[PDB]
Amino acid sequence: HLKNISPIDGRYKKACGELSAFFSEHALIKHRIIVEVRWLLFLNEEELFFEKVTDHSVEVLNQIATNITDSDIARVKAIEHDVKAVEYFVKEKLKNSKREDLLKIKEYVHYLCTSEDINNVAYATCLKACLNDVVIPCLEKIMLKLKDLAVEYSHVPLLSRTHGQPASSTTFGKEMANFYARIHHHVGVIRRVKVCAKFNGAVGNFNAHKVASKDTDWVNTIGLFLKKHFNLTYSIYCTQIQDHDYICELCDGLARANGTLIDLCVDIWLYISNNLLKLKSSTMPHKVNPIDFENAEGNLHIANAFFKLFSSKLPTSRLQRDLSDSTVLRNIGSSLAYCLIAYKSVLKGLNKIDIDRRNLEEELNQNWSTLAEPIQIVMKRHNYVDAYEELKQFTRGKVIDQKIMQEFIKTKCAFLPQDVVDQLLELTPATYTGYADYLAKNVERLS
Amino acid sequence: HLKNISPIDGRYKKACGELSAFFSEHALIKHRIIVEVRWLLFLNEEELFFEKVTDHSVEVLNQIATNITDSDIARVKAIENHDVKAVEYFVKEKLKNSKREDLLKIKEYVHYLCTSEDINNVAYATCLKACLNDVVIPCLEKIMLKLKDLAVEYSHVPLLSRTHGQPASSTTFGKEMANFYARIHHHVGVIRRVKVCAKFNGAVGNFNAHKVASKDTDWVNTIGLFLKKHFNLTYSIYCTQIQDHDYICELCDGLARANGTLIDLCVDIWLYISNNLLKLKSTMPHKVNPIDFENAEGNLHIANAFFKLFSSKLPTSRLQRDLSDSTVLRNIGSSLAYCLIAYKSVLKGLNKIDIDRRNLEEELNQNWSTLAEPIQIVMKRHNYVDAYEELKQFTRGKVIDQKIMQEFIKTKCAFLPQDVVDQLLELTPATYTGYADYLAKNVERLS
Numbered sequence A: 001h002l003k004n005i006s007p008i009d010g011r012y013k014k015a016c017g018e019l020s021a022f023f024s025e026h027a028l029i030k031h032r033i034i035v036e037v038r039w040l041l042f043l044n045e046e047e048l049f050f051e052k053v054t055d056h057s058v059e060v061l062n063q064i065a066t067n068i069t070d071s072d073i074a075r076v077k078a079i080e081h082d083v084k085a086v087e088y089f090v091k092e093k094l095k096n097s098k099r100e101d102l103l104k105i106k107e108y109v110h111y112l113c114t115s116e117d118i119n120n121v122a123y124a125t126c127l128k129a130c131l132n133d134v135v136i137p138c139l140e141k142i143m144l145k146l147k148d149l150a151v152e153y154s155h156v157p158l159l160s161r162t163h164g165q166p167a168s169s170t171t172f173g174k175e176m177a178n179f180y181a182r183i184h185h186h187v188g189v190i191r192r193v194k195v196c197a198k199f200n201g202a203v204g205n206f207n208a209h210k211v212a213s214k215d216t217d218w219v220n221t222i223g224l225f226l227k228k229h230f231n232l233t234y235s236i237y238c239t240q241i242q243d244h245d246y247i248c249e250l251c252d253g254l255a256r257a258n259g260t261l262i263d264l265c266v267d268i269w270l271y272i273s274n275n276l277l278k279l280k281s282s283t284m285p286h287k288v289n290p291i292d293f294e295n296a297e298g299n300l301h302i303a304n305a306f307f308k309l310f311s312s313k314l315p316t317s318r319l320q321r322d323l324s325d326s327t328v329l330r331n332i333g334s335s336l337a338y339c340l341i342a343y344k345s346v347l348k349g350l351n352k353i354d355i356d357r358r359n360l361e362e363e364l365n366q367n368w369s370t371l372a373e374p375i376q377i378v379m380k381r382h383n384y385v386d387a388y389e390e391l392k393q394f395t396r397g398k399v400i401d402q403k404i405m406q407e408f409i410k411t412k413c414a415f416l417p418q419d420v421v422d423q424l425l426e427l428t429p430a431t432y433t434g435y436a437d438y439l440a441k442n443v444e445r446l447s
Numbered sequence B: 001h002l003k004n005i006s007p008i009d010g011r012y013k014k015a016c017g018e019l020s021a022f023f024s025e026h027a028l029i030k031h032r033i034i035v036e037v038r039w040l041l042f043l044n045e046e047e048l049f050f051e052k053v054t055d056h057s058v059e060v061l062n063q064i065a066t067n068i069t070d071s072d073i074a075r076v077k078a079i080e081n082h083d084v085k086a087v088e089y090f091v092k093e094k095l096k097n098s099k100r101e102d103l104l105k106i107k108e109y110v111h112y113l114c115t116s117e118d119i120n121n122v123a124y125a126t127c128l129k130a131c132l133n134d135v136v137i138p139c140l141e142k143i144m145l146k147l148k149d150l151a152v153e154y155s156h157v158p159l160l161s162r163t164h165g166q167p168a169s170s171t172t173f174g175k176e177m178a179n180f181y182a183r184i185h186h187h188v189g190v191i192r193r194v195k196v197c198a199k200f201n202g203a204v205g206n207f208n209a210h211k212v213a214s215k216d217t218d219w220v221n222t223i224g225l226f227l228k229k230h231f232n233l234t235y236s237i238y239c240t241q242i243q244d245h246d247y248i249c250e251l252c253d254g255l256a257r258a259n260g261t262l263i264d265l266c267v268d269i270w271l272y273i274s275n276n277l278l279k280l281k282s283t284m285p286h287k288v289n290p291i292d293f294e295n296a297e298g299n300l301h302i303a304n305a306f307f308k309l310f311s312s313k314l315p316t317s318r319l320q321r322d323l324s325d326s327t328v329l330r331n332i333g334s335s336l337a338y339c340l341i342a343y344k345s346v347l348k349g350l351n352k353i354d355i356d357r358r359n360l361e362e363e364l365n366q367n368w369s370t371l372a373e374p375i376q377i378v379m380k381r382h383n384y385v386d387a388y389e390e391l392k393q394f395t396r397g398k399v400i401d402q403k404i405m406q407e408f409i410k411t412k413c414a415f416l417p418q419d420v421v422d423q424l425l426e427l428t429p430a431t432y433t434g435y436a437d438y439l440a441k442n443v444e445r446l447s
Helices: A013-019 A025-046 A055-066 A070-079 A082-095 A100-108 A115-152 A172-191 A207-212 A218-230 A245-273 A291-313 A324-329 A332-352 A357-365 A368-381 A387-395 A402-412 A418-426 A436-441 B013-021 B025-046 B055-066 B070-079 B083-096 B101-109 B116-153 B173-193 B208-213 B219-231 B246-274 B291-313 B324-329 B332-350 B357-365 B368-381 B387-395 B402-412 B418-426 B436-441
Strands: A157-162 A165-171 A277-279 A353-355 B158-163 B166-172 B278-280 B353-355
Touching: A013 A115, A013 A332, A025 A055, A025 A070, A025 A082, A025 A100, A025 A115, A025 A218, A055 A082, A055 A100, A070 A082, A082 A100, A082 A115, A115 A172, A115 A218, A115 A245, A115 A332, A115 A436, A157 A172, A157 A357, A165 A172, A165 A368, A165 A436, A165 B208, A172 A245, A172 A436, A172 B246, A207 B166, A207 B368, A245 A277, A245 A291, A245 A332, A245 B173, A245 B246, A245 B291, A291 A324, A291 A332, A291 B246, A291 B291, A332 A353, A368 A387, A368 A402, A368 A418, A368 B208, A387 A402, A402 A418, B013 B025, B013 B116, B013 B332, B025 B055, B025 B070, B025 B083, B025 B101, B025 B116, B025 B219, B055 B083, B055 B101, B070 B083, B083 B101, B083 B116, B116 B173, B116 B219, B116 B246, B116 B332, B116 B436, B158 B357, B166 B173, B166 B368, B166 B436, B173 B246, B173 B436, B246 B278, B246 B291, B246 B332, B291 B324, B291 B332, B368 B387, B368 B402, B368 B418, B387 B402, B402 B418
Parallel strands: none
Antiparallel strands: A157 A165, A277 A353, B158 B166, B278 B353
């Protein structure tokens, strides 16, 4: 463990260990056994090449796929050239059953298949289960926290910064709502991607299948196989390999989600740096650093490096295939582990956040110049011309503060109805927040 | 023009020139004028701040947007935040020069409540949407059409597959082109489903100004109406000073995956031509090079450099915004120009393609070893065990040819019913193509 080179299987092992069920040699051997068994179960239920075995013999066949133990995986690696060992393992387990039924049909293990028929279905089921069971729910945990923050702090005023400089006020809940909205959108796009598989023999064309059974409609038959036994979409058109385009789509989608989370990580770092948030060191006893957000920032960038690699190399495979796709594909697990490490750090980070009210309100009260616009807007509503230049002229050579802005209102805007004058004099930076509070508390509803 | 640094505006200007309607300073100024005019038209039809002008005054206002000439653009650049304020002055001046008391009153409402990113993001959205729908996607769809025509025309024409570059079970040229059709069809559909979004929410995304100007207006609904009615755009409610750009990233990711498929196509055709299986209609008079596919390959890689840039930098904008996004966005035009240049070269390339039948047929008849599998599958259908090892033992030390494979059939497979034996002796590499012909000609329906 301590001698492991990859931080995935080294220091971050506990944070990402649940991925081993979907992505690892163990997981891969396991799902290949399942595919070979279900292919044989399917050939039996279709009776393409033999008559159906007894109800008990199917049960014994099915059991090879359902009870997969560490010793079963150990026996496959002992035979290992990758999927041929799996083929050998299934045949052996059918031979050691001593049922004449299964000893006859043993020879139909891997019948018609290329090794990529088995692998692509195994990868597809692993990727689909991983995303739906582990990765997307983790992202959805982040959205939930962002929603709760959006509602809880919907009203809490916060000085905006554009180009780093003070601007019209917002609320902390609103700024968190914007991230909810972005991630809500990315998650929807990702779950609309259909995980696809094929099962078309050596070269994609059912060459072998046509000679073996000339009147079988193999397009409909494989469609059935993939839907019934794996709940997968069938991509009919392929070479020796599945095109991988769906993996590219998913990874593009997760990479956009990750870019939003990088934006979030940096903004929170910035709010914490500005002393507007607090978190619930070797030298300074009260120094508290946003390390969860920093650690996530780095791991999201790494995840995305893998994602950019996938969508750039996966689309190219020379002719009816080159093998370089398969070493790359072996890294989907790593890519999603970096995602998972980062997502867990964002969550740890978000759960430590509290507002610093006194600091939020002090800053707003030191930035009265952000009332420049609503004063100009009101002046223009009552037919004032060159409102900006008037404020500019009045403040020339002055350090704009509350007294200056309110003196501007009293003397330069007195032509306004006095009710309107009084409304402007009631305005403060903290109180000029538009529909920020409305928009933050309704983010889920307004999706 | 010959002094231009970018090949976009230099050597490839004729190939990509129709993009300047959508992407150029001229196009940008033009669309900004349109946004400002329509905002003022919308304010008038809602009567938020003034009572409706005469039917002819609206006509005169709308005409500023409809008749945009080079001299109008010249006038804006002469006036040239500093960018959109010139546009704002341009529209005001045109309303002043109308001498209509109606428009002299309402001209002060030009750009009322707007930030410059309200204007720009709508202008960008309308330009991007129109460009994709009118120029870029139809160019991609032209490539699809040609691939479909190639798939049908050559559906039957046998071609030796290569896996790891080595001979494999036969396919057809039409089938190999159909795989590409299917992939591109898919990419185009994904790209057309991306919704082009815009916002119009003032300084900081929260309608701060709007709320003080008209306290009982629901600005969310109002802007939804504005954007749908005047531009037919989706409204992304949640923003800062900037629109988040997430839809741009989706589009570019979508175009990048299409481009990767085309790179794969470009390389495969280069390889088929290299192998003398296709022909194209300074020293070597009969040397003919696949330059169209080569040129496209390079320009697709460049297009993807920009797209990877967009999807990685556009997601980050510090706090309520940093300005780095705006220089980057100025390059969408360039990115789409490199796309268009490459798509036109792929089209030029595909229209020169013809098969070399004699070469296709001779290669297949030099590769009888690819009949290994159908022989083995027929043996195993009739209960043969270790079919592979039997063929391997028979061919040990021999250079496999037609005589060898057919001698294997005659003497080693004679236990099969004689009808099956003669079916095997009827097989040739060119006639072991599976459902390639049927899959190729039916690609439009099946994919």
